[PDB]
Structures are given as structure tokens and as C-alpha cells.
Amino acid sequence: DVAGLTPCKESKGFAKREKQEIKKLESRLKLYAPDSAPALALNATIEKTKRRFAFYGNEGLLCGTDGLPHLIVDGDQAHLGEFVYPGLVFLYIAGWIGWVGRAYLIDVRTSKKPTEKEIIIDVPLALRIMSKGLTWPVAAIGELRSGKLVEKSANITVS
Amino acid sequence: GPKRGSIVKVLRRESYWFNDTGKVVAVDQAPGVRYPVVVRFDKVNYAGVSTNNYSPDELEAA
Amino acid sequence: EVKIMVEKDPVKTSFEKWAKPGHFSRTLAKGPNTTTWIWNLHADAHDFDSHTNDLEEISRKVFSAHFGQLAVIFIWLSGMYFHGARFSNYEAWLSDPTHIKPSAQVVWPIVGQKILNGDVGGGFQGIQITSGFFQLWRASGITSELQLYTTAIGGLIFAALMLFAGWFHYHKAAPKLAWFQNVESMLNHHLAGLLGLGSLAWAGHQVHVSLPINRLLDAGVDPKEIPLPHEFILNRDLLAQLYPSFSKGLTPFFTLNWSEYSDFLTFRGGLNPVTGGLWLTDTAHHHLAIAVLFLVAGHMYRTNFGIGHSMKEILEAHKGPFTGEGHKGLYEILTTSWHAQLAINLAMLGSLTIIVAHHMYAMPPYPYLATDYATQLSLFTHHMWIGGFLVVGAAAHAAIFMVRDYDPTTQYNNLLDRVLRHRDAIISHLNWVCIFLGFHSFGLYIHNDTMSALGRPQDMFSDTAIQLQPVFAQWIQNTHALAPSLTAPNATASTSLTWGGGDLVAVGGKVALLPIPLGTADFLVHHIHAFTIHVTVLILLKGVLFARSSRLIPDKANLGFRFPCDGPGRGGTCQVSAWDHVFLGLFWMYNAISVVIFHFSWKMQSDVWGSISDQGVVTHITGGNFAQSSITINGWLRDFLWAQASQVIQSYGSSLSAYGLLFLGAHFVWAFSLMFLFSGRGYWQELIESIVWAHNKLKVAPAIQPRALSIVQGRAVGVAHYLLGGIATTWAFFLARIISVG
Amino acid sequence: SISDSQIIVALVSAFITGILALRLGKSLY
Amino acid sequence: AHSVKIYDTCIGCTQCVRACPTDVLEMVPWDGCKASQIASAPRTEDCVGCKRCESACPTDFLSVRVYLGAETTRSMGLAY
Amino acid sequence: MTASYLPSIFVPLIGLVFPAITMASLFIYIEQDE
Amino acid sequence: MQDVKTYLSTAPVLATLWFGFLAGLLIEINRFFPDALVLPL
């Protein structure tokens, strides 16, 4: 459809990309007995290959003129499962990491030896902050609105 | 100059601690000293020192 | 005089010094103000002579660290044996060592990496190893996975034992300085006890278990029907069936009539015609002789029993006219300084590793070793690299000694002083000979390249045009070829098949060894080897000699062994310490060893290896194109790099895929090294400020201030990444080539 | 320049241009 | 021939002159910091550019500054 | 090529003689104290 | 026992424990949910 790519469950080049690999695996397989560890491993590999090729066609990815999936990172509603759906969860996880790290730094900074608490972590406080870091957007936006997110008296100097 | 144990912020444009805070140690009250205020900071510079002396008109924010 | 000396419980074992990360040195025990604390912590984590000043604690720490290292080596060995026991096709290999590729590592199927478990043969699937452990176990007489399991456990035990000792002799019973200084008894016990008795024990094992089992393996019997290694110990008749000399009991050895032991104590050159390896009946005799040699050599030095030499009267007695006051004051150097000993030990051990790498390829000591080309190439390259590293380490530690252990108030003993007093001559002449060698070695290649480019090959330096046949090597080859007839009447054959004498030996197809020719292409590369070695010696010796002072900086010893530079003055003084000379010599060592291993690889694939067919016709791998195509740099570019690099690049989708991946990975690491090797600290330290600004803007400023790497750590990182990338690239290339085509 | 005299013309013109460049360089120094 | 300068922030640490390996910097009476001491560079004709002076002054940025100028035989550190 | 004897006259006079004389002139100009 | 906990609170030990737990998690996920290219949600 879009970008001149056909869906993968109709691509006549995907069939070859499957059957050639299957036949290679079977050529490897025919060097043992059907009741030996190499044969079991190879049959498992073949079943995994079939299960993989019978999922891309059902998902809705568009293959190319060479029989290979192509990702439409465009915003297309028929393809949200390629970029934006995993991208949102990644952004969630990364904001989580950053927010809990920032909060740990903020809390440690007001102590006796803050430099000591950075080579020797204090696991109770760090764990508390990691736990509380689940609702980080509702906290980051709240700190932005309340004017608590940024400083103004930065210590940069240039003569 | 300023009081002892007072938290002042630097204005020396060529200072490592520019726009940073520090607590005075002891300002010398001699007649002809050009930089009597002595302030110690909680972060060393590229050379490793944390104490430095300024003139009273060169640093004040309270 | 010589006695046991121990201080009961000098250090309480606890966890207090364990919680404070920096504890050994007081300068950084306070805490990490900036982030250049995490770095120098690990930097001087092992600088035992820098933390404290008394030789006693330094010696105790050295002892316990040696014990820890031995424990780690034991864990490594037990792991290799356990893998050979549990995940190896060893028993299948034993039934057909010429069609089964060794393999002792399997990979879990997780993300498609299952294909790394290639079809090695025998109903097994795993990565094909090249350590040569299968050949070693076959030569040892090991014939069952059980006999591996046990020894694995054995290794583990020793590991724990070592660890125990390592703790004990530092925390419960640690010696005192006066005990370590007894070098006479130490050498006595390392000669007679460690080397002599060790060689005697291994000769015993050989002559009792390794000879009959391997002989029955050569007679073509099943490795399962061979009696167990103790049926030849509790049955002298079952062993005498092969070597009937055992029927004569232990009487020939005691009546000096032991010329009847010629069955299992032989003197025969060449290789076993069926295994392509040395005769174990010869190595048993060799070990038996080496053992008594080291044993009678372990009685030279004086202990508290009146007799023996003292290695101070021996030294002072050698004092000639030309050389001032002789070797005086050197016994005081090698017993009050751990570095002057480490230098000599590292130099000798590196040279010995090079000798081993040169001997093993020419006289294969394990069965079916010369046949497996991959193992014989890896065992050369690895050992060469190890020796090349150890010699540079020796240079570095000699420089360290000269920097902070030498003192003149006692070194008026004009041997070290005299060589220190004409450094401006030593280095000048070494520089001149380096220039001469470089020209007369590389300019010849440039000549050949220009001629072959100008359509005039008749003016080249080939074997058809102007010739440069090495006559001395050819004469040595012809002399050793005739030794078993004139200069060695009892040896049945020459020591090696690489000498011009002898003939070819086959191991069922592929060839093992044959007489190696030597033409102009070998003359040129040998002179190139000499030139690179000379340049490396130049750099290292210049550093060592000028470690104390020079015309530029007369007080360099005050600055120390490791420091970036003495200002941008005097025109510039960057990279002026001895550490920087070691930094510069590492690259030339890398160059030299890479040229050596390229030489060996191409020459072996071209003029030694191959697969012979019936009627005698032997076709080498490349086709003998080394004598003609190795005289021009273009030949090394296409006929060696471009041609032989055609296996690794197209290894994708095969069992050799990891080599194709690590090719590009090592290329990336090598190119990554250039960022550190070319740049400098100031730019990065400035750039970091503009990131700390963005951090402060959002209140994420760390308390450990992010300083950039020091001027010396940048160089260290650069050379480390450079060496890793280069060696890993050559590793991947060599393995992916030889595994497929060998 | 398929002819013969034309090469001589080119040569003498190049020589004049060279003298001019020489004078300019002398003036620039 | 390099140009040394001593700005009026020297607290009289005397380290600059202790470090300079050419007898270039010397102490001088100058009231104003604590001890009426200051540095002085009369023999700048001998400075090689070692910058050992600047690596010693524990002032905010610096009080003794070396500016590398015209090169000579003394400043190049030559012995031949 | 019309002349075909000029390339045998010029490149010996421009790759051998020209550098030989300009390097000498520039070396006399460099190593002089005026 | 307190100093043992302090040592276990060091940077390299916490780093390797965290990265090993994460590696185990990702490895298990890939062994149970293999060949994930498109989010089926």
C-alpha cells in the first residue's frame, strides 16, 4: 500500500525467504538421527522459524521488492505498532530512570558528605525513590508548573 | 567587610566560583589590604583549592 | 644464617578497610572530591611500593598476590578440564582424530545464536576450539571423560588451597624481610626442587602411563579396550608386552647397565609417521635427562651447611680493565629492589615464550598437532603476542627501578654507572643502525614496487632478477641436515623436518612438515624483522637510560616515573618521561609481532601445508606464491590481505559468523582509539563545562565534579584500545581463514 | 596549436607574462 | 624572552620562586597582602616556559602569568 | 604532437634544473645575515 | 556485618547486581517472547 510496499502475507518473495531457510535447516538436520540432541535442537529452530514467519504476516507489516519487512515510522494509524506504541513505553521507562536519578541526587545533595553517598549508595533511600518514581509525568509537570524544576543562578563564567 | 560565617555569592568574573556561594572565614581589618575577605567553598577548582580571598566590593549577595 | 622467619598475625583480618574504598594510600583515602579519584584508585591499586616504604610489607603483599594469581590460574585450568569433560566431543574425537574437529564449548539457544554450534562431527554441535587441549590430553594418555571430571575437581581443590595460603601468609604467619632475601636457598630450591623434581615426576608419568597407552593408540585399537593407566603399574608383564625392557626390572638403572633401556629411552629425530608428532619414547628420555641436569645444577649456592657458592664473591671476582669496578654492588641491587628483579624475569620469560613459539611449530610435540593447522597457527600467534608484551613490561620495570630505586651514593660501582655515562653514544649508534636497517630493508620493497609498476620487472630484487639468497641460513640448514651422520652418530635422524634434509611426512592427506626453502623473499622479511626489533630496542633503551635526567630536563628524576610533560617551554617537552617511552614502544612491538605472524601465516600456507594426493603430488594451500609475490607491498595487499580476507567477510549465516562480527567490532575499537590518541585534555575539559551547565539548569549537577581524563590516562586508553582492536582483528581474520581452509 | 610558429608565440607570451609576474612580486616585497 | 607578569593578588606564598628552576622569580617587599611580600620577575631573559610558576600559585585564577614570546637559545633550553 | 622534441627538452629543464637552481638561490637567501 | 552491607552498597557491586538482574530479565523475556519486531498491542 503506502510507499509502494505490499503486505507481507501476500508477498511472493517472503515465501522464498521462508522456504530457502527451511530447506537449509533440513539439509543441516539430515546429518544426524531423529533421536539425538542436534536433531532436537534443529527441529526446535525450524519450529521457531515457522512461528516467526507466521506472525509478521498476521501483524500487518509491509514487505519490500526483496521480501523483507519495512517499518513505516510515519504516524500511520494502521502501523502504530511499529514506532509510536513501543516508543511511548520506552519514553515512559527512560523518564522513570531519569526522574528517579534526579530525585536521588536532589535528596543526597543535602547531607553531610554528599560525595560519599555517590560512590556508596544508601539502598533504603534509593529504593524508596525508585518506588515513588512510577508516576513521574504527574510529578515532572507538577514541578514545572510550580517553578521548582530549573535554577536561575547558574555558575557559568567567561572572561 | 561582611560578617563572619556569612554566606556570600561571588561576582569575580574570572573566578571558578563565580555565581556560587561560600561562607566567610575571617576578613582581615588591616588598613592597606586589597583583598581582605577570606571565603571557603565546598567544591574544589581545577587546581584543587577551596579557599580564596576577595575584596568586599567584589562579592555580596547574602 | 638461613632460617625460617615469621611474624605471628601481623594484620587482623576484618572488613573495616574493606568498607573504605580508598585505604591503601592516604592521599586519596579521604574521598572523591572530583571524578579523577575513581580513576587513580584503580590506577595505583597495585602500586605496593608506593603506598608504604618498608620492603617488608611490600614483600608480604607481593607474596599474597602471587598466591591469589596462582588460585585464579588453577580455577582457569579446572574450568578448561571440566569443559573438556562435560561439553566436548573428546571420546568421539579419539575414535577418528583426522575427520572430527575439536570442540569443547556449546552455546545456549536464545536469540538465534544457536547457529554458532556448528556441525563439528561425531554427533556434536558446538564452537570449534583451537587451544590444542585435545592433543595434549591424547598425549597425556587421557582416554575417558571420567579421567577429566576428577582432575577438574582436583584443580578446584588446589584453587581453594592457594587462596588459603594467600590468606595465611599475610594474616596468620607472614614472613619478614630477612626471609625473602635468602636468594641462594631460593635458587637452590627452584632449580633442584621445582624444575628438577617436576621434570622427574613428569618423566615418570610419561614412562609409566603415557607410553603404553599412546603406543596402543598408534596400533589402531579402540580407546575403550585400552587397559586403564593403573593396569600398567600393578602389572609389569602387561606393560612389558610392548617394551620388553621392563621385564628386566629396576636392575639396569642401579648397575649402570642402563644401555638396555633403549626400548623406551630412545634418541630418534623426526616425527612419528602416523601421528605427525615427536616420539614419546624420546620425550621421556629428554625429561629424564633434564631432571638430573636441574638436580645436579641445584647444588651450586651456599646455605648454612658450609659448602656452596655465594653470589657476591662470584660477582666481584669479574672486574676487568675496560669495565671499571666490575659487577660490584649488583647483589645489593637485586635483593633490595623488587623492580630490578621483575625486569630481568619479564625479559627472560618473554624471550623464552618466543623461543617456545618458534620451537613448537617446527617440532610438533603432540599427536595430530601438525595436521590441525588452526591449532598450530593459534599456538604460534598467541605465544608470540605474550612474549612481545612481556619484553616491553621488562623495559618498563627497568625504567621504574632506574627512576625511583637507583641511588649513586652506593652505585659508584662502575658497571651501571659506566653504561649510564655514555648513553649519548649508545643511543646515537642505535639510532644510526636503525636508520640503516630501515632504509636497506624497506627501500628494497619500494624499489621492487616501483619496478613492477614501471613495467620493468627485470630490475627488481626477485629470485629471477638480482638475487639476495641468504647463504648463512642455507648453510645452517645443510649442516643440521647432515648431523645424524657426522656430528651426531647416535641420533637416528635430524632434530626437525624443517632442515633441508629428510623428506615429507603425511598424516592421512594433509601434510605435516617438509624441508623449508629460503630465498630472497625470506632475506628481505628477516631484515625487516631485525629492523623493527632494533627500533623497539631503541625506544625502550632510550627511555630506560634517560629515565633519570637529560640535557633537556636535568632534574627529571624529581618529577617521577609517570608524568605528562614539563610545560610547553623549551620549545615543548610533551611525552618526556619513561612511561611515555613505554607508551611509544608498545606500538612498535605491535608492528613487529604483526609482521612476524603475517610472515609465518603466509609462508606456512604457501610452502609448507597442503594436501598430498596419491603418487606423491602435493599442492599447497595458496600454491607456492610466496617466493614471487611477497617481494612487493602490493603483493602483501592483494595476495595476502585481499585474497585471504575473503573467508571472514562472507562468513555471515554460517557457523563462523562470530569471527565476521568481531572483525568489524575490532575495526571499530581500533578506530575508536584514535579519538584518544589524537586529541587532548583541554578541549574535552572545556566541552564538559557546557554539559555541566545544562545539568545545573535542571538541578542534576553531581557532587563528584566531572573532570576529564588526565593527560596520561588519555594515552593509556588510546594505546589499550589500539592494541585491542588490532590484535582482535588479526585474531578474527586468522581464525576465520584457517578454520575454513585448514 | 597544431602549427609550429604558434608554439613559439605561446612561449614568448609566457615569457612576457613571467617578467610581469616578476615585477609584481618585487613590488609586493 | 618570554613575558612574565605578577598581578596584585599574590598573597606571598613564595612558591612561585621556589619552583622556578632558573632563578627568574624573586621576592620583593610590597605591603598590602599580609606580609608585605610580592613576587617579581627581573630575569625573564632566562625563563624557558616551564610554567612551573603557574602550577604553584594557589590564587583564584592565577597571579603569575607567563606569555610565550620570541624564542632564543636560553629559552629553548638548548645545550648544543 | 607537432614538436615532439620539446618534452625531451623541458621536463629535464623543469624537474631537474629548475629545482636545482631555485633551491640553491633560496638556501643562499635563507642562510644569510645581511 | 554492617561493614559487609556497606561494601555491598558500593558502586561496582550494585552496578553488576543491577545489570545482571536486568540481563536475566531481558533474556527470559526473549526466550519466552522471541522475534518481537512489532508491538501487537
Added chain:
Amino acid sequence: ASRFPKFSRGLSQDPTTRRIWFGIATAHDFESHDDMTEERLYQKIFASHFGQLAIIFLWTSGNLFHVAWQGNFEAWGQDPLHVRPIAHAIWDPHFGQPAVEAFTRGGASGPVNIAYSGVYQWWYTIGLRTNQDLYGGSIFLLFVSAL
């Protein structure tokens, strides 16, 4: 001003070899010279610009003359798909016979180089069809460079 760099004293009094090097490096930094004013600088820029234009036009005239004298432009004009444009001829006294036979390709009588600069198509498009036109252009460019 009594040694090689007459526009600087610091390099003049330099006894070392560096005097040579930094004399060639700081040779066009007219701003950081000795006794420089804002009216000598600009005139030196002007004269150097004129010299640069002269050099450019001399280079172009040389290209024209060498394509006209040794090239095969006329032949290329009537078959621009089955002939190779010749840049100039080579006369290397180090050559060997196989090299002469190898580099004598094209239509030339001796060994030559093949022009990969695209000047043939350019000159042919704008309406040049004979070596005479190239020679006229070359002499005219010599004239304008002299000017």
C-alpha cells in the same frame, strides 16, 4: 628584518631551525607583522588578489593549450561515446617498454593521460570544434593574465 623573515623580529633572532618553518607559516598573516597599518594591509590584499587571478587564468590557459597541442579534441567531437578524452602526453625517462605500450591508448602516437575533468564536454557544448579555437582561447587567457 635582517634575516629570512623580514616582516618579524621574533623569527629573525631565532637561532634554531624553527626560524625557517615559522617563516613560511606566518607569511600571509599581514595583520600580525611588524609596523603594519590599515592602509598597507588593504593594498597588500588587493595586490595578492590580482596575483591570484593571474594564477587562475594562467592555469586555465595552460589547460586549453595542453588539450589543443596533445589532445584529440577533434576526434572526440565526432564520436563522443567510443573515444577517450586525452588530458596531455607523458614523457617519463624511467618508463619501461610495457608501460609505454600500456599508456599509449586512445588515439595518440605516444603514451598519454585520459582527461577525467570533463573539460571536453564543457568546451564542446559552448561551441568549440577545433584546436584553433582552443589555441585562441589560450593566447587570449595569457593576455588577460598579463593584464
Added chain:
Amino acid sequence: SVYFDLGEIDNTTGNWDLYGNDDPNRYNGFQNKFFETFAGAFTKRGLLLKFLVLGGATTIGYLGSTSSPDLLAIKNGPKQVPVMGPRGRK
């Protein structure tokens, strides 16, 4: 016993000539006379540099121009047929 002096400054700076043969005449007077009357005019360096440059110029000219066909390879020209263009060119 002392190795310094301001008077004999050359003794304390190493200005000695370690190999000096003060022999005023070593060769035959006739041979010297016959050698200086022939290699004497070559002393004038101002009239020798401009002589050498012209000699070398004319030498590499005559030898570069009046060469031989057999000697040089770039002078003997091609004596074969030219190879063809890989894309049907000439």
C-alpha cells in the same frame, strides 16, 4: 690539578684540534705546480656556480634531446597495437 682558567680559556672549553698535521708540503713541487695551473681558475665561486648550472643545463639538454632509440623506453615509443576501451571506447 685544576681544570679552569680565564687566561687559557681554550684549555677549559675543549677547543683543541685533536688531529693536526702541520706538514707544510707533502707532494711533488712539479706535480703541485701542474695541479694548481689547471685547477686554479676553478677557485672563483662566483664564476663557478654560474658555470656549473649552465654546464648541467646544456648537458641534460643535449643528452635529453640527442638520445638513442634503443637506450630509452619513452623515446622508442609504442611498437604494438593499443588495447581497447572496456566500454567499447578507443
